[PDB]
Design an enzyme around this catalytic site. Structure first.
Site, PDB file in Angstrom:
ATOM      1  N   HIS A  17      22.388  -1.682  81.168  1.00  0.00           N
ATOM      2  CA  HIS A  17      21.925  -1.279  79.862  1.00  0.00           C
ATOM      3  C   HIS A  17      21.730   0.238  79.801  1.00  0.00           C
ATOM      4  CE1 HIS A  17      20.009  -5.474  79.812  1.00  0.00           C
ATOM      5  NE2 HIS A  17      20.986  -5.486  78.930  1.00  0.00           N
ATOM      6  N   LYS A  41      17.149 -17.510  72.658  1.00  0.00           N
ATOM      7  CA  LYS A  41      16.497 -17.903  73.894  1.00  0.00           C
ATOM      8  C   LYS A  41      15.122 -17.275  74.091  1.00  0.00           C
ATOM      9  CE  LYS A  41      17.439 -17.450  78.688  1.00  0.00           C
ATOM     10  NZ  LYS A  41      17.027 -16.046  78.362  1.00  0.00           N
ATOM     11  N   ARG A  90      30.732  -6.093  78.213  1.00  0.00           N
ATOM     12  CA  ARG A  90      30.849  -6.354  79.642  1.00  0.00           C
ATOM     13  C   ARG A  90      32.064  -7.216  79.930  1.00  0.00           C
ATOM     14  NH1 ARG A  90      25.489  -9.262  81.082  1.00  0.00           N
ATOM     15  NH2 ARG A  90      26.030  -9.119  78.846  1.00  0.00           N
ATOM     16  N   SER A 128      21.038  -9.211  82.713  1.00  0.00           N
ATOM     17  CA  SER A 128      19.633  -9.453  82.732  1.00  0.00           C
ATOM     18  C   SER A 128      19.362 -10.833  83.352  1.00  0.00           C
ATOM     19  CB  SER A 128      19.005  -9.395  81.333  1.00  0.00           C
ATOM     20  OG  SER A 128      18.688  -8.063  81.001  1.00  0.00           O
TER      21      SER A 128
HETATM   22  N1  LIG Z   1      26.035  -4.622  82.274  1.00  0.00           N
HETATM   23  C1  LIG Z   1      26.206  -4.006  81.094  1.00  0.00           C
HETATM   24  N2  LIG Z   1      27.125  -3.005  81.071  1.00  0.00           N
HETATM   25  C2  LIG Z   1      27.316  -2.384  79.915  1.00  0.00           C
HETATM   26  N3  LIG Z   1      26.730  -2.575  78.745  1.00  0.00           N
HETATM   27  C3  LIG Z   1      25.784  -3.543  78.788  1.00  0.00           C
HETATM   28  C4  LIG Z   1      25.483  -4.285  79.917  1.00  0.00           C
HETATM   29  N4  LIG Z   1      24.487  -5.203  79.621  1.00  0.00           N
HETATM   30  C5  LIG Z   1      24.246  -5.008  78.365  1.00  0.00           C
HETATM   31  N5  LIG Z   1      24.977  -3.981  77.786  1.00  0.00           N
HETATM   32  C6  LIG Z   1      24.818  -3.551  76.378  1.00  0.00           C
HETATM   33  O1  LIG Z   1      23.489  -3.005  76.214  1.00  0.00           O
HETATM   34  C7  LIG Z   1      22.829  -3.685  75.129  1.00  0.00           C
HETATM   35  C8  LIG Z   1      21.826  -4.674  75.599  1.00  0.00           C
HETATM   36  O2  LIG Z   1      21.830  -6.008  75.099  1.00  0.00           O
HETATM   37  P1  LIG Z   1      20.626  -7.044  75.565  1.00  0.00           P
HETATM   38  O3  LIG Z   1      19.467  -6.187  76.001  1.00  0.00           O
HETATM   39  O4  LIG Z   1      21.191  -7.898  76.790  1.00  0.00           O
HETATM   40  O5  LIG Z   1      20.245  -7.983  74.364  1.00  0.00           O
HETATM   41  P2  LIG Z   1      20.998  -8.877  73.308  1.00  0.00           P
HETATM   42  O6  LIG Z   1      22.490  -9.199  73.777  1.00  0.00           O
HETATM   43  O7  LIG Z   1      20.169 -10.265  73.123  1.00  0.00           O
HETATM   44  O8  LIG Z   1      21.011  -8.176  71.990  1.00  0.00           O
HETATM   45  C9  LIG Z   1      24.007  -4.275  74.303  1.00  0.00           C
HETATM   46  O9  LIG Z   1      24.666  -3.188  73.722  1.00  0.00           O
HETATM   47  C10 LIG Z   1      24.829  -4.805  75.485  1.00  0.00           C
HETATM   48  O10 LIG Z   1      26.066  -5.299  75.105  1.00  0.00           O
END
Ligand SMILES: Nc1ncnc2c1ncn2[C@@H]1O[C@H](COP(=O)(O)OP(=O)(O)O)[C@@H](O)[C@H]1O
Ligand SMILES: [Cl-]
Ligand SMILES: [Mg+2]
Length: 163
Positions: A17, A41, A90, A128
């Site tokens: 993130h 969730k 991702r 996550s």
């Molecule tokens: N491993 C990763 N690598 C790159 N970008 C990511 C990664 N994990 C999440 N992101 C991006 O960062 C943000 C975080 O999303 P998240 O905190 O998991 O909540 P949600 O998908 O429920 O809105 C989104 O833009 C996501 O697609």
């Protein structure tokens, strides 16, 4: 205005993130990290815990402001005067859920664009979910999350709860 919003449940924020957040902050003059309560969730951490973890891990990045919001992301973005919503992509499976979300947002406010950045480096394998599972079973998460998040997970799993 060169303003963008980076929304997510960030439960908890990971290095994957943070890479998206820093790449976004490098392009835009101001970036608002929004912890979205929304979810399909139940979150491990509360909104307030997630916000504080985020504040602590991005305090040295000056053009980043971490907030949370009551309403729709699209109205929060308008309130910030942001023209772009930034999301990471991702895997191929991140496709369809992200496509519905952007299709809806485009109807509600077509002047605000959704930009996707590919997780195109060494954090692409993480999520996550993987960090929470590893943590729950006593594995090491130091290569996956900032030290502050690693400690919050140790603290969270020591507390009794629906986990
Ligand atoms: N491993 C990763 N690598 C790159 N970008 C990511 C990664 N994990 C999440 N992101 C991006 O960062 C943000 C975080 O999303 P998240 O905190 O998991 O909540 P949600 O998908 O429920 O809105 C989104 O833009 C996501 O697609
Ligand atoms: Cl710009
Ligand atoms: Mg441990």
């Amino acid at each position: 205005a060169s303003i963008a919003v980076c929304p997510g449940s960030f439960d908890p924020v990971t290095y994957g993130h943070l890479d998206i957040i820093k790449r976004g902050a490098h392009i835009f003059e101001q970036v608002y990290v929004c912890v979205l309560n929304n979810s399909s969730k139940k979150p491990l951490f509360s909104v307030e815990e997630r916000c504080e973890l985020l504040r602590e891990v991005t305090k040295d990045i000056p053009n980043i402001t971490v907030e949370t919001s009551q309403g729709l992301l699209i109205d929060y973005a308008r309130r910030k005067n942001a023209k772009a919503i930034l999301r990471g992509l991702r895997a191929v499976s991140d496709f369809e859920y992200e496509m519905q979300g952007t299709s809806v947002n485009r109807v509600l406010d077509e002047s605000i664009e959704t930009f996707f950045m590919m997780a195109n480096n060494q954090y692409s394998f993480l999520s996550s979910s993987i960090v929470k599972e590893v943590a729950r079973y006593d594995g090491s998460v130091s290569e996956f999350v900032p030290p502050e998040v690693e400690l919050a997970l140790q603290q969270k799993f020591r507390q009794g709860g629906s986990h």
